[PDB]
Amino acid sequence: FTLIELMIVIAIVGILAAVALPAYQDYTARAQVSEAILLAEGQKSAVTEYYLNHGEWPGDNSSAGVATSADIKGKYVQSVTVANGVITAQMASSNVNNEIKSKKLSLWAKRQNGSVKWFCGQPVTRTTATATDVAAANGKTDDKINTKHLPSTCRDDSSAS
Ligand SMILES: *[C@@H]1O[C@H](C)[C@@H](NC(C)=O)[C@H](O)[C@H]1NC(C)=O
Ligand SMILES: *OP(=O)(O)OC[C@H](O)CO
């Protein structure tokens, strides 16, 4: 070899050092959102029990049997709220992935004739406790967890049934 080869390998070392990284933030965000998925799944039993014994979805955390929304918190989850049978888990505002800062995801259920289908994904809103349909939460600001920061199994739409 010669000096040109050594300069070329130095340039290649620089290329490798300054190589672009994949969107590992998305995967870390998925891992952190898994915590809120588990926390929202925790309240599924209470919400389902109230719906079965009363015929209408739990309007608030109070009659769902679950604690206050601020109390249902984890390392990366700041709140898990139940609104008309829809379990919405909100991320933390700091010490979390920047992609999922202060973002929410919903875990709602639809009662079929033979089962109670459970759907997980972007935030949804049920108007009344007796309503059998859900709709997207609101535009407002970016409170929706991006679908790339959610598991592929947790990307259900508001129209899913
Ligand atoms: C529990 O959620 C119910 C949906 C609600 N009923 C109505 C008609 O709003 C009820 O008031 C709640 N109970 C408590 C103790 O908050
Ligand atoms: O009522 P909830 O437990 O959803 O908490 C309200 C507060 O503004 C942050 O969640």
Label each residue of 67-89 as H, E or C.
Answer: CCCCCCCCCCEEEEEEECCEEEE
Q: How many domains does the chain have?
A: 1
For residues 107-139, b (16+ Cβ closer than 10 Å) or e, as one string? Answer: bbbeeeeeeeeebbbbbbbbeebeeeebeebee
- Residue 69 Cβ < 6 Å to ligand 2: yes
Report the distance separating Cα 98 and Cα 49, nearest Å: 36
CATH number of the domain within which 36 lies: 3.30.700.10
Measure the CA dihedral 74/35/82/160, to 10°: 170
Domain membership of residue 122 (yes or no) is: yes
Domain membership of residue 142 (yes or no) is: yes
Domain membership of residue 9 (yes or no) is: no
Q: Indicate the resolution in Å.
A: 2.5
Domain membership of residue 129 (yes or no) is: yes
Domain membership of residue 18 (yes or no) is: no
Domain membership of residue 4 (yes or no) is: no
- Residue 68 Cβ < 6 Å to ligand 2: yes
Domain membership of residue 71 (yes or no) is: yes
Domain membership of residue 11 (yes or no) is: no
Distance in Å, CA 10 to ligand 1 centroid = 69
